[PDB]
């Protein structure tokens, strides 16, 4: 089997991407944030505290003939941005882009933090990191990908995120029309439960490539590119008037600037992030200070190749017995 679904930016900045997902019988379609940095499929639901719901579409298990309470199971998750959610668990039929899993754990939110409530466009998350990170207790659950894997034509999914445009998540096949040149594959460590890999270095603009190992995660659920402070300082030094602002919480730059590109290494291959991908616009409405898309990871504890980086590439998440990542230009 295969699946193929379009993923659509939630706003004009590509802050996140939503992908329609069918849950239950008859289908209830919710728009989920596919997140390769977490392992829970959770939804706004009929159980979510009413004051914490503001515009989201909800999953109502009582209206699904295939929903079953997963008795005694609870979940609770905290993300790197300080947001959180928790609740109880149903199993139900879940389809993405024509690919169906029966018996998927659908984590129903009883509580969500303010950042979720305030984002009316995201009806929940679909985690695509390794199932070792799934938070269901006392019986850990599998991701949608792990439950689909044995049925897929190939044990892979691909992320093809757009810049200010829709893109595609595919499951079970590699669309050879969706990228240019060849795919460079690189090793993955699953020790922390992430798609963790090691970039071979970077360049700023037309500058020379610096060969240096940068361990980080491929995380579709993170907007920006978070790299070591040395790398980030070297980037922003090429932008007149850029500075790190403790009041704003990262590097800002004059909105009048033209940003340089940023290149990262994948083995001997190179992925170029155009400068315009690194512009996240005014820090507040009407400001002439703009927020940068490359930020320091120093306060996180891991480097994160978020959407800024991934949307410059066609990315293969290879879930074979020995997982690997692949990157191609596009």
Curated annotation (Swiss-Prot):
Its EC number is 3.4.23.22. The lineage of its organism: Eukaryota, Fungi, Dikarya, Ascomycota, Pezizomycotina. Keywords: Aspartyl protease, Disulfide bond, Hydrolase, Protease, Signal, Zymogen. The chain holds residues 90 to 419 of 419 of the full protein. The active site is at 35, 199. GO terms for biological process: proteolysis. It comes from the Eukaryota. Residues 17-328 form the Peptidase A1 domain. The gene is EAPA. This is Endothiapepsin. It is an enzyme of class 3 (hydrolase). It catalyses: Hydrolysis of proteins with specificity similar to that of pepsin A, prefers hydrophobic residues at P1 and P1', but does not cleave 14-Ala-|-Leu-15 in the B chain of insulin or Z-Glu-Tyr. Clots milk. One of its GO terms (molecular function) is aspartic-type endopeptidase activity.
């Amino acid at each position: 089997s295969t699946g193929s679904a379009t993923t659509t930016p939630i706003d004009s900045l590509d802050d996140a991407y939503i992908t329609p997902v069918q849950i239950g019988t008859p289908a209830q379609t919710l728009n989920l944030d596919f997140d390769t940095g977490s392992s829970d499929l959770w939804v706004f639901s009929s159980e979510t505290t009413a004051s914490e719901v503001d515009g989201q579409t909800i999953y109502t298990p009582s209206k699904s003939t295939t929903a079953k309470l997963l008795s005694g199971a609870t979940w609770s998750i905290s993300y790197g941005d300080g947001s959180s959610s928790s609740g109880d668990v149903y199993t139900d039929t879940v389809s993405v882009g024509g690919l169906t899993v029966t018996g998927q754990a659908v984590e129903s939110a009883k509580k969500v933090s303010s950042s979720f409530t305030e984002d009316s466009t995201i009806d929940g998350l679909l985690g695509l990191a390794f199932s070792t990170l799934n938070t269901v207790s006392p019986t850990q659950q599998k991701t949608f990908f792990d439950n689909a894997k044995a049925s897929l034509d190939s044990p892979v999914f691909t992320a093809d995120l757009g810049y200010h445009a829709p893109g595609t998540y595919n499951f079970g096949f590699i669309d050879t029309t969706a990228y240019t040149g060849s795919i460079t594959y690189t090793a993955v460590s699953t020790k922390q439960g992430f798609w963790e890999w090691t970039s071979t270095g970077y360049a700023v603009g037309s500058g020379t490539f610096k060969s240096t190992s940068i361990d980080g995660i491929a995380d579709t659920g993170t907007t920006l590119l978070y790299l070591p402070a040395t790398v980030v300082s070297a980037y922003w030094a090429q932008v007149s008037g850029a500075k790190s602002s403790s009041s704003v919480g990262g590097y800002v730059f004059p909105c009048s600037a033209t940003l340089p590109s940023f290149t990262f290494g994948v083995g001997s291959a190179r992925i170029v992030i155009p400068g315009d991908y690194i512009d996240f616009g005014p820090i507040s409405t009407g400001s002439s200070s703009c927020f940068g898309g490359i930020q320091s990871s120093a306060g996180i504890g891991i480097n994160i190749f978020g959407d800024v980086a991934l949307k410059a590439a066609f990315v293969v998440f290879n879930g074979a017995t020995t997982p690997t990542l692949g990157f191609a230009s596009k």
